């Protein structure tokens, strides 16, 4: 039973030519969102066909979207679809279609134009957000080093995602989701002061009724731990003692049989 992600609750509009669309997203006990897509088509084209050959704009799970040079006095329709990591059948949920047309009666809100900021410099490429009287760095791209910090800076200055070709390292704080990973050394690390490095199936804990695998270092008791199997049939190991619930077989029949000659019995 996979619960698809919940579509954005509401849509608002801001205009300047340029048109901005931002959608609020709230979710509970549902699939987490990983990407947001907006599709915009002309209303007449929508009547002719349903969202087919409709230009789409994709964002990295950012609520606000910007359309530059929107058609003037032309009807349009939009939908915002949340994207999750589930199966294709319920991977994506789309919001309710909302029509919209640029009109002389629509108030012009140019505040969003000033509230952001980007700059192209020989030294780097940098994006900023206007916060009161100051500007906060969003992402940086240095010229001397191919370092790309992504995300609003922490109060202590810790960037969420960091890169370093100099050390040939890709540094990401948080989580990484990939279909597969190929490597030569899965060296688990106790990155935090009190972390517990381990490899396991999601939502599995040692000495638990779940049916997963758990392997890692238990910093609480400072001993390695292991568990493979369900609640009843399992291979559970603690540094002090090992327990194997399931039936165990050692060797194979005729393991030490003479190859040149067989065996037999007679009376």
């Amino acid at each position: 039973n996979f619960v698809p992600p919940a579509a954005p609750i509401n849509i608002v509009f801001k205009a300047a030519y340029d048109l901005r669309v931002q959608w609020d997203w709230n979710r509970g006990a549902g699939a987490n969102v990983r990407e947001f897509v907006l599709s915009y088509i002309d209303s007449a084209e929508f009547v002719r066909t349903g969202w087919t050959k409709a230009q789409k704009i994709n964002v990295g799970a950012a609520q606000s979207a910007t359309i530059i040079s929107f058609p003037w006095k032309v009807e349009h329709k939009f939908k915002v679809s949340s994207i999750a990591w589930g199966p294709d059948a319920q991977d994506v949920t789309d919001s309710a279609v909302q029509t919209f047309i640029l009109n002389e009666s629509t108030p012009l809100d140019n505040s969003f134009v000033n509230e952001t900021g980007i700059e192209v410099n020989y030294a780097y490429i940098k994006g900023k957000i206007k916060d009161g009287s100051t500007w906060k760095q969003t992402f940086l791209i240095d010229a001397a080093t191919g370092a790309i910090n992504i995300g609003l800076l922490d109060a202590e200055g810790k960037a969420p995602i960091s890169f370093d070709p100099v050390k040939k390292i890709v540094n990401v704080d948080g989580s990484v989701i990939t279909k597969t990973i190929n490597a030569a050394n899965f060296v688990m690390t106790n990155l935090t002061g009190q972390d517990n490095p381990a490899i396991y199936t999601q939502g599995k804990t040692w000495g638990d009724t779940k049916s997963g695998i758990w392997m890692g270092m238990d910093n609480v008791t400072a001993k390695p731990k292991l568990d493979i199997g369900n609640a009843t049939q399992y291979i559970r190991y603690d540094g002090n003692i090992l327990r194997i619930s399931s039936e165990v077989v050692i060797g194979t029949p005729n393991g030490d049989i003479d190859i040149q000659t067989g065996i037999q019995g007679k009376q």
């Binding site: 002061g193 009190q194 910093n219 609480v220 008791t221 400072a222």
Partner: peptide, 8 residues
């Protein structure tokens, strides 16, 4: 006796 998971 060995144990861990204690503050600093």
């Amino acid at each position: 006796i060995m144990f861990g998971g204690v503050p600093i």
